[PDB]
Short mmCIF file of all heavy atoms in Angstrom, two decimals:
data_model
loop_
_atom_site.label_atom_id
_atom_site.label_comp_id
_atom_site.label_asym_id
_atom_site.label_seq_id
_atom_site.Cartn_x
_atom_site.Cartn_y
_atom_site.Cartn_z
N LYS A 303 -13.59 8.34 1.51
CA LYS A 303 -14.96 7.95 1.37
C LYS A 303 -15.08 6.81 0.37
O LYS A 303 -14.28 6.71 -0.56
CB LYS A 303 -15.80 9.16 0.91
CG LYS A 303 -15.76 10.33 1.85
CD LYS A 303 -16.10 9.91 3.29
CE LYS A 303 -16.40 11.10 4.18
NZ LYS A 303 -16.68 10.60 5.59
N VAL A 304 -16.06 5.95 0.59
CA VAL A 304 -16.24 4.77 -0.25
C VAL A 304 -17.19 5.06 -1.40
O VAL A 304 -18.29 5.60 -1.20
CB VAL A 304 -16.80 3.57 0.57
CG1 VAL A 304 -17.01 2.33 -0.34
CG2 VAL A 304 -15.89 3.26 1.77
N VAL A 305 -16.79 4.67 -2.61
CA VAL A 305 -17.64 4.88 -3.78
C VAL A 305 -18.87 3.98 -3.63
O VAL A 305 -18.74 2.76 -3.49
CB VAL A 305 -16.86 4.65 -5.07
CG1 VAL A 305 -17.79 4.72 -6.32
CG2 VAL A 305 -15.69 5.69 -5.20
N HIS A 306 -20.08 4.55 -3.68
CA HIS A 306 -21.25 3.74 -3.34
C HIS A 306 -21.55 2.57 -4.29
O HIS A 306 -22.06 1.54 -3.86
CB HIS A 306 -22.50 4.54 -3.07
CG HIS A 306 -23.46 3.80 -2.21
ND1 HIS A 306 -23.17 3.50 -0.90
CD2 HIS A 306 -24.66 3.23 -2.48
CE1 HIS A 306 -24.18 2.82 -0.38
NE2 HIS A 306 -25.10 2.65 -1.32
N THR A 307 -21.23 2.72 -5.57
CA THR A 307 -21.42 1.63 -6.50
C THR A 307 -20.59 0.37 -6.11
O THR A 307 -21.02 -0.76 -6.37
CB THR A 307 -21.16 2.08 -7.90
OG1 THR A 307 -19.98 2.88 -7.94
CG2 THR A 307 -22.37 2.96 -8.43
N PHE A 308 -19.43 0.57 -5.49
CA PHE A 308 -18.65 -0.54 -4.96
C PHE A 308 -19.45 -1.25 -3.87
O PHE A 308 -19.56 -2.50 -3.85
CB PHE A 308 -17.30 -0.02 -4.44
CG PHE A 308 -16.41 -1.09 -3.82
CD1 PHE A 308 -16.12 -2.25 -4.50
CD2 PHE A 308 -15.80 -0.88 -2.58
CE1 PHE A 308 -15.28 -3.18 -3.96
CE2 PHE A 308 -14.97 -1.83 -2.04
CZ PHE A 308 -14.72 -2.97 -2.73
N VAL A 309 -20.01 -0.45 -2.95
CA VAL A 309 -20.89 -0.97 -1.91
C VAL A 309 -22.03 -1.78 -2.52
O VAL A 309 -22.30 -2.90 -2.06
CB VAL A 309 -21.49 0.13 -1.00
CG1 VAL A 309 -22.53 -0.49 -0.02
CG2 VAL A 309 -20.40 0.91 -0.28
N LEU A 310 -22.71 -1.22 -3.53
CA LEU A 310 -23.83 -1.94 -4.14
C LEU A 310 -23.38 -3.29 -4.73
O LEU A 310 -24.08 -4.30 -4.54
CB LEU A 310 -24.55 -1.06 -5.16
CG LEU A 310 -25.19 0.21 -4.59
CD1 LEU A 310 -25.78 1.08 -5.73
CD2 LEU A 310 -26.27 -0.06 -3.53
N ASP A 311 -22.26 -3.31 -5.46
CA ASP A 311 -21.76 -4.57 -6.05
C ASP A 311 -21.50 -5.57 -4.95
O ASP A 311 -21.95 -6.71 -5.01
CB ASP A 311 -20.46 -4.40 -6.82
CG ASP A 311 -20.65 -3.69 -8.12
OD1 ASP A 311 -21.81 -3.59 -8.57
OD2 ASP A 311 -19.63 -3.20 -8.65
N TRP A 312 -20.81 -5.12 -3.91
CA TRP A 312 -20.41 -6.03 -2.84
C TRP A 312 -21.59 -6.55 -2.04
O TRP A 312 -21.56 -7.68 -1.56
CB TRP A 312 -19.46 -5.33 -1.87
CG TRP A 312 -18.44 -6.24 -1.25
CD1 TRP A 312 -18.45 -7.60 -1.21
CD2 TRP A 312 -17.28 -5.82 -0.50
NE1 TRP A 312 -17.34 -8.05 -0.53
CE2 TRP A 312 -16.61 -6.98 -0.09
CE3 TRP A 312 -16.73 -4.56 -0.18
CZ2 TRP A 312 -15.42 -6.94 0.65
CZ3 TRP A 312 -15.55 -4.52 0.54
CH2 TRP A 312 -14.91 -5.70 0.96
N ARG A 313 -22.63 -5.74 -1.87
CA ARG A 313 -23.81 -6.17 -1.14
C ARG A 313 -24.55 -7.38 -1.76
O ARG A 313 -25.29 -8.06 -1.06
CB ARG A 313 -24.79 -5.03 -0.90
CG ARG A 313 -24.26 -4.03 0.11
CD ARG A 313 -25.25 -2.93 0.42
NE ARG A 313 -24.81 -2.18 1.61
CZ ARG A 313 -25.48 -1.18 2.16
NH1 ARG A 313 -26.65 -0.80 1.66
NH2 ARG A 313 -25.01 -0.58 3.24
N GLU A 314 -24.36 -7.60 -3.05
CA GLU A 314 -24.94 -8.77 -3.70
C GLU A 314 -24.37 -10.10 -3.16
O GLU A 314 -25.08 -11.08 -3.10
CB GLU A 314 -24.72 -8.68 -5.22
CG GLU A 314 -25.50 -7.54 -5.87
CD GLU A 314 -27.04 -7.68 -5.70
OE1 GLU A 314 -27.63 -8.70 -6.17
OE2 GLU A 314 -27.67 -6.79 -5.09
N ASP A 315 -23.10 -10.12 -2.76
CA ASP A 315 -22.42 -11.32 -2.20
C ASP A 315 -22.61 -11.35 -0.69
O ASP A 315 -21.69 -11.09 0.11
CB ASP A 315 -20.93 -11.27 -2.52
CG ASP A 315 -20.65 -11.33 -4.01
OD1 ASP A 315 -21.60 -11.66 -4.73
OD2 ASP A 315 -19.50 -11.10 -4.42
N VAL A 316 -23.84 -11.69 -0.30
CA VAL A 316 -24.26 -11.54 1.07
C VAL A 316 -23.36 -12.15 2.12
O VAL A 316 -23.04 -11.50 3.13
CB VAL A 316 -25.74 -12.02 1.22
CG1 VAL A 316 -26.15 -12.05 2.68
CG2 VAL A 316 -26.68 -11.08 0.40
N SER A 317 -22.92 -13.37 1.89
CA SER A 317 -22.16 -14.12 2.87
C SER A 317 -20.69 -13.74 2.98
O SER A 317 -19.99 -14.28 3.81
CB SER A 317 -22.30 -15.62 2.60
OG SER A 317 -23.68 -15.97 2.66
N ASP A 318 -20.23 -12.82 2.15
CA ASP A 318 -18.84 -12.35 2.23
C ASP A 318 -18.71 -11.47 3.47
O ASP A 318 -19.23 -10.33 3.49
CB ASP A 318 -18.52 -11.57 0.96
CG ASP A 318 -17.07 -11.17 0.87
OD1 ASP A 318 -16.40 -11.06 1.92
OD2 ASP A 318 -16.63 -10.92 -0.28
N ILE A 319 -18.00 -11.98 4.48
CA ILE A 319 -17.88 -11.28 5.76
C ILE A 319 -16.93 -10.08 5.70
O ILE A 319 -16.89 -9.27 6.61
CB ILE A 319 -17.49 -12.23 6.94
CG1 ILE A 319 -16.04 -12.70 6.84
CG2 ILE A 319 -18.53 -13.37 7.05
CD1 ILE A 319 -15.51 -13.32 8.13
N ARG A 320 -16.17 -9.97 4.63
CA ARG A 320 -15.21 -8.90 4.53
C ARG A 320 -15.89 -7.58 4.30
O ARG A 320 -15.32 -6.56 4.62
CB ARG A 320 -14.26 -9.12 3.40
CG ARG A 320 -13.37 -10.34 3.58
CD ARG A 320 -12.59 -10.66 2.33
NE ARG A 320 -13.49 -11.09 1.25
CZ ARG A 320 -13.09 -11.56 0.07
NH1 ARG A 320 -11.81 -11.69 -0.21
NH2 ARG A 320 -13.96 -11.92 -0.84
N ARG A 321 -17.08 -7.60 3.71
CA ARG A 321 -17.79 -6.36 3.35
C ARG A 321 -18.02 -5.46 4.57
O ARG A 321 -17.57 -4.33 4.58
CB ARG A 321 -19.07 -6.67 2.62
CG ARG A 321 -19.89 -5.40 2.16
CD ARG A 321 -21.20 -5.75 1.41
NE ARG A 321 -21.97 -6.62 2.28
CZ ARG A 321 -22.06 -7.94 2.19
NH1 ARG A 321 -21.48 -8.64 1.20
NH2 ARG A 321 -22.72 -8.58 3.13
N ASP A 322 -18.68 -5.97 5.58
CA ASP A 322 -18.92 -5.21 6.81
C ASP A 322 -17.65 -4.92 7.63
O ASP A 322 -17.65 -3.98 8.43
CB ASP A 322 -19.96 -5.91 7.68
CG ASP A 322 -21.30 -5.97 7.02
OD1 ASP A 322 -21.66 -5.02 6.28
OD2 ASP A 322 -22.01 -6.96 7.22
N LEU A 323 -16.62 -5.75 7.47
CA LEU A 323 -15.35 -5.52 8.14
C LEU A 323 -14.52 -4.47 7.44
O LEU A 323 -13.64 -3.89 8.08
CB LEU A 323 -14.54 -6.80 8.26
CG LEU A 323 -15.11 -7.79 9.25
CD1 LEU A 323 -14.46 -9.18 9.13
CD2 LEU A 323 -14.92 -7.25 10.70
N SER A 324 -14.83 -4.20 6.16
CA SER A 324 -14.09 -3.27 5.34
C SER A 324 -14.67 -1.87 5.19
O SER A 324 -13.92 -0.88 5.08
CB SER A 324 -13.93 -3.87 3.94
OG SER A 324 -13.18 -5.08 3.98
N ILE A 325 -16.00 -1.78 5.27
CA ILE A 325 -16.75 -0.54 4.99
C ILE A 325 -17.66 -0.18 6.16
O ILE A 325 -18.41 -1.03 6.63
CB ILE A 325 -17.61 -0.67 3.72
CG1 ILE A 325 -16.75 -1.04 2.51
CG2 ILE A 325 -18.41 0.60 3.42
CD1 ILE A 325 -17.55 -1.34 1.20
N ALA A 326 -17.54 1.08 6.61
CA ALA A 326 -18.31 1.60 7.72
C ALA A 326 -19.45 2.46 7.20
O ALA A 326 -19.22 3.48 6.57
CB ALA A 326 -17.44 2.46 8.66
N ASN A 327 -20.67 2.05 7.50
CA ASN A 327 -21.85 2.84 7.15
C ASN A 327 -22.28 3.68 8.35
O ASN A 327 -23.41 4.19 8.39
CB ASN A 327 -22.99 1.92 6.70
CG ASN A 327 -23.52 1.02 7.80
OD1 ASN A 327 -22.96 0.93 8.91
ND2 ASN A 327 -24.64 0.35 7.52
N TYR A 328 -21.34 3.90 9.27
CA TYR A 328 -21.62 4.53 10.55
C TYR A 328 -20.50 5.46 10.92
O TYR A 328 -19.43 5.38 10.34
CB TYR A 328 -21.68 3.44 11.65
CG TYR A 328 -20.42 2.60 11.77
CD1 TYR A 328 -19.34 3.02 12.56
CD2 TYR A 328 -20.28 1.40 11.06
CE1 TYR A 328 -18.19 2.27 12.67
CE2 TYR A 328 -19.11 0.65 11.15
CZ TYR A 328 -18.07 1.08 11.98
OH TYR A 328 -16.89 0.36 12.08
N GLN A 329 -20.75 6.28 11.93
CA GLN A 329 -19.76 7.18 12.49
C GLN A 329 -20.00 7.15 14.01
O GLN A 329 -21.00 6.64 14.48
CB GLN A 329 -19.98 8.62 11.99
CG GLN A 329 -21.33 9.25 12.32
CD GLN A 329 -21.34 10.71 11.86
OE1 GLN A 329 -20.31 11.39 11.97
NE2 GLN A 329 -22.45 11.16 11.29
N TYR A 330 -19.08 7.74 14.76
CA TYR A 330 -19.22 7.82 16.20
C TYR A 330 -19.44 9.29 16.56
O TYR A 330 -18.59 10.15 16.24
CB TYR A 330 -17.96 7.33 16.87
CG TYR A 330 -17.69 5.88 16.63
CD1 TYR A 330 -16.66 5.47 15.81
CD2 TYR A 330 -18.49 4.90 17.23
CE1 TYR A 330 -16.41 4.12 15.60
CE2 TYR A 330 -18.25 3.53 16.99
CZ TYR A 330 -17.20 3.15 16.17
OH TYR A 330 -16.93 1.81 15.94
N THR A 331 -20.55 9.56 17.23
CA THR A 331 -20.89 10.89 17.73
C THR A 331 -20.39 10.92 19.20
O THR A 331 -19.83 9.94 19.70
CB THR A 331 -22.44 11.11 17.69
OG1 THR A 331 -23.06 10.30 18.68
CG2 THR A 331 -22.99 10.75 16.33
N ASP A 332 -20.59 12.02 19.90
CA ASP A 332 -20.16 12.07 21.29
C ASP A 332 -20.80 10.93 22.13
O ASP A 332 -20.17 10.43 23.04
CB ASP A 332 -20.49 13.41 21.94
CG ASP A 332 -19.62 14.56 21.41
OD1 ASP A 332 -18.86 14.35 20.46
OD2 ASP A 332 -19.72 15.67 21.97
N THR A 333 -22.02 10.52 21.81
CA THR A 333 -22.71 9.50 22.61
C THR A 333 -22.93 8.12 21.99
O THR A 333 -23.17 7.15 22.74
CB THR A 333 -24.09 10.01 22.99
OG1 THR A 333 -24.76 10.43 21.80
CG2 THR A 333 -23.99 11.20 23.93
N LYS A 334 -22.83 7.98 20.67
CA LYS A 334 -23.15 6.68 20.07
C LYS A 334 -22.59 6.45 18.67
O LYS A 334 -22.12 7.37 18.00
CB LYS A 334 -24.68 6.58 19.97
CG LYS A 334 -25.31 7.61 19.03
CD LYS A 334 -26.82 7.82 19.25
CE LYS A 334 -27.70 6.63 18.87
NZ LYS A 334 -27.83 6.42 17.38
N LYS A 335 -22.65 5.17 18.27
CA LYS A 335 -22.37 4.72 16.91
C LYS A 335 -23.68 4.97 16.21
O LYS A 335 -24.75 4.53 16.66
CB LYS A 335 -22.06 3.22 16.89
CG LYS A 335 -21.79 2.60 15.54
CD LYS A 335 -21.29 1.18 15.81
CE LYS A 335 -21.13 0.32 14.59
NZ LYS A 335 -20.67 -1.05 14.93
N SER A 336 -23.61 5.72 15.13
CA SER A 336 -24.80 6.13 14.41
C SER A 336 -24.64 5.91 12.92
O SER A 336 -23.56 6.13 12.38
CB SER A 336 -25.01 7.61 14.70
OG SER A 336 -26.04 8.13 13.91
N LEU A 337 -25.70 5.50 12.25
CA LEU A 337 -25.59 5.30 10.79
C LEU A 337 -25.48 6.64 10.08
O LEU A 337 -26.14 7.59 10.45
CB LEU A 337 -26.82 4.59 10.24
CG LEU A 337 -26.98 3.16 10.70
CD1 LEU A 337 -28.40 2.69 10.32
CD2 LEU A 337 -25.84 2.24 10.13
N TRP A 338 -24.66 6.68 9.04
CA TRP A 338 -24.51 7.88 8.22
C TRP A 338 -25.83 8.39 7.68
O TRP A 338 -26.06 9.60 7.62
CB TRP A 338 -23.50 7.62 7.07
CG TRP A 338 -22.11 7.95 7.43
CD1 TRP A 338 -21.10 7.10 7.68
CD2 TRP A 338 -21.59 9.26 7.63
NE1 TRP A 338 -19.95 7.79 7.96
CE2 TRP A 338 -20.24 9.13 7.95
CE3 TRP A 338 -22.13 10.54 7.52
CZ2 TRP A 338 -19.42 10.23 8.19
CZ3 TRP A 338 -21.33 11.61 7.75
CH2 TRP A 338 -20.00 11.45 8.10
N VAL A 339 -26.75 7.49 7.33
CA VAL A 339 -28.02 7.91 6.78
C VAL A 339 -29.03 8.44 7.78
O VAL A 339 -30.04 9.00 7.36
CB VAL A 339 -28.70 6.79 6.01
CG1 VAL A 339 -27.78 6.34 4.90
CG2 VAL A 339 -29.06 5.63 6.96
N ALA A 340 -28.76 8.31 9.08
CA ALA A 340 -29.72 8.74 10.11
C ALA A 340 -29.84 10.25 10.12
O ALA A 340 -28.85 10.96 10.32
CB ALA A 340 -29.32 8.21 11.51
N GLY A 341 -31.03 10.72 9.79
CA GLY A 341 -31.34 12.13 9.81
C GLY A 341 -31.90 12.48 11.18
O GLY A 341 -32.09 11.63 12.04
N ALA A 342 -32.16 13.77 11.36
CA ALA A 342 -32.66 14.28 12.62
C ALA A 342 -33.94 13.55 13.06
O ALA A 342 -34.08 13.22 14.23
CB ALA A 342 -32.91 15.78 12.50
N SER A 343 -34.84 13.25 12.13
CA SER A 343 -36.12 12.59 12.47
C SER A 343 -36.07 11.08 12.53
O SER A 343 -37.00 10.45 13.00
CB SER A 343 -37.20 13.03 11.47
OG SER A 343 -36.71 12.83 10.14
N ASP A 344 -34.97 10.49 12.11
CA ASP A 344 -34.90 9.03 12.06
C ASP A 344 -34.80 8.30 13.41
O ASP A 344 -34.15 8.77 14.35
CB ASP A 344 -33.73 8.58 11.18
CG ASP A 344 -34.01 8.75 9.70
OD1 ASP A 344 -35.02 8.18 9.21
OD2 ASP A 344 -33.20 9.42 9.04
N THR A 345 -35.47 7.15 13.47
CA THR A 345 -35.36 6.21 14.56
C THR A 345 -34.32 5.21 14.08
O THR A 345 -33.86 5.28 12.94
CB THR A 345 -36.69 5.47 14.80
OG1 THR A 345 -37.12 4.84 13.58
CG2 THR A 345 -37.80 6.45 15.28
N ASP A 346 -33.92 4.28 14.94
CA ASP A 346 -32.97 3.25 14.53
C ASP A 346 -33.52 2.40 13.38
O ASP A 346 -32.77 2.03 12.47
CB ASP A 346 -32.59 2.33 15.72
CG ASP A 346 -31.73 3.04 16.80
OD1 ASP A 346 -31.14 4.11 16.52
OD2 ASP A 346 -31.68 2.52 17.94
N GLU A 347 -34.80 2.06 13.47
CA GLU A 347 -35.48 1.25 12.45
C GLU A 347 -35.60 2.00 11.10
O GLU A 347 -35.30 1.42 10.07
CB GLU A 347 -36.86 0.77 12.93
N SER A 348 -35.96 3.28 11.13
CA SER A 348 -36.09 4.04 9.87
C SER A 348 -34.73 4.21 9.21
O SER A 348 -34.61 4.07 7.98
CB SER A 348 -36.82 5.39 10.07
OG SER A 348 -36.05 6.34 10.79
N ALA A 349 -33.68 4.47 10.01
CA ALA A 349 -32.35 4.64 9.48
C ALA A 349 -31.88 3.32 8.88
O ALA A 349 -31.29 3.29 7.79
CB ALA A 349 -31.39 5.10 10.57
N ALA A 350 -32.11 2.22 9.58
CA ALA A 350 -31.74 0.90 9.04
C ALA A 350 -32.41 0.63 7.66
O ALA A 350 -31.77 0.14 6.75
CB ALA A 350 -32.10 -0.19 10.03
N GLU A 351 -33.70 0.98 7.54
CA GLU A 351 -34.46 0.79 6.29
C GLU A 351 -33.88 1.65 5.16
O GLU A 351 -33.71 1.20 4.02
CB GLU A 351 -35.93 1.14 6.52
CG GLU A 351 -36.82 0.83 5.32
CD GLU A 351 -38.26 1.32 5.49
OE1 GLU A 351 -38.47 2.39 6.10
OE2 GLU A 351 -39.18 0.65 4.96
N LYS A 352 -33.59 2.90 5.48
CA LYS A 352 -32.95 3.77 4.50
C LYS A 352 -31.61 3.22 4.08
O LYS A 352 -31.26 3.22 2.89
CB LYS A 352 -32.74 5.17 5.06
CG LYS A 352 -33.99 6.02 5.18
CD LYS A 352 -33.62 7.40 5.72
CE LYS A 352 -34.81 8.26 5.96
NZ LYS A 352 -34.36 9.57 6.53
N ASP A 353 -30.83 2.72 5.05
CA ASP A 353 -29.48 2.27 4.69
C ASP A 353 -29.50 1.10 3.69
O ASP A 353 -28.67 1.02 2.80
CB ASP A 353 -28.65 1.89 5.91
CG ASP A 353 -27.18 1.82 5.59
OD1 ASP A 353 -26.57 2.91 5.38
OD2 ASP A 353 -26.66 0.67 5.47
N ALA A 354 -30.48 0.20 3.83
CA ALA A 354 -30.55 -0.98 2.98
C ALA A 354 -31.06 -0.74 1.55
O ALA A 354 -30.70 -1.46 0.64
CB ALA A 354 -31.45 -2.03 3.67
N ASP A 355 -31.87 0.29 1.37
CA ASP A 355 -32.52 0.58 0.09
C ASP A 355 -31.64 1.50 -0.75
O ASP A 355 -31.39 2.61 -0.36
CB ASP A 355 -33.86 1.24 0.37
CG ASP A 355 -34.70 1.46 -0.88
OD1 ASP A 355 -34.14 1.53 -1.98
OD2 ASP A 355 -35.94 1.54 -0.74
N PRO A 356 -31.19 1.03 -1.93
CA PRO A 356 -30.28 1.85 -2.72
C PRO A 356 -30.81 3.19 -3.19
O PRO A 356 -30.01 4.05 -3.51
CB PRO A 356 -29.93 0.96 -3.92
CG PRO A 356 -30.94 -0.08 -3.94
CD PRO A 356 -31.44 -0.28 -2.55
N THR A 357 -32.13 3.36 -3.21
CA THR A 357 -32.73 4.58 -3.69
C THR A 357 -32.87 5.62 -2.56
O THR A 357 -33.26 6.75 -2.82
CB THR A 357 -34.14 4.30 -4.31
OG1 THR A 357 -35.05 3.86 -3.29
CG2 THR A 357 -34.05 3.24 -5.42
N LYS A 358 -32.61 5.22 -1.31
CA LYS A 358 -32.78 6.10 -0.16
C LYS A 358 -31.46 6.66 0.42
O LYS A 358 -30.41 6.01 0.39
CB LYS A 358 -33.55 5.35 0.95
CG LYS A 358 -34.96 4.85 0.52
#
Side-chain angles (χ1 to χ4, degrees), residues 303-346 348-357:
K303 301 308 194 182
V304 179
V305 174
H306 204 66
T307 44
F308 178 52
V309 174
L310 298 175
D311 287 344
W312 212 344
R313 290 183 167 182
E314 293 299 300
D315 296 347
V316 172
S317 301
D318 186 335
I319 71 165
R320 295 171 294 187
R321 181 180 55 259
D322 296 326
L323 289 167
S324 298
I325 302 174
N327 66 351
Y328 58 86
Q329 60 175 323
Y330 295 109
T331 71
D332 290 7
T333 53
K334 64 198 292 287
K335 178 171 173 181
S336 172
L337 293 168
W338 269 106
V339 301
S343 51
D344 285 303
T345 55
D346 291 342
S348 71
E351 186 186 35
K352 286 181 184 179
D353 196 72
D355 186 336
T357 66

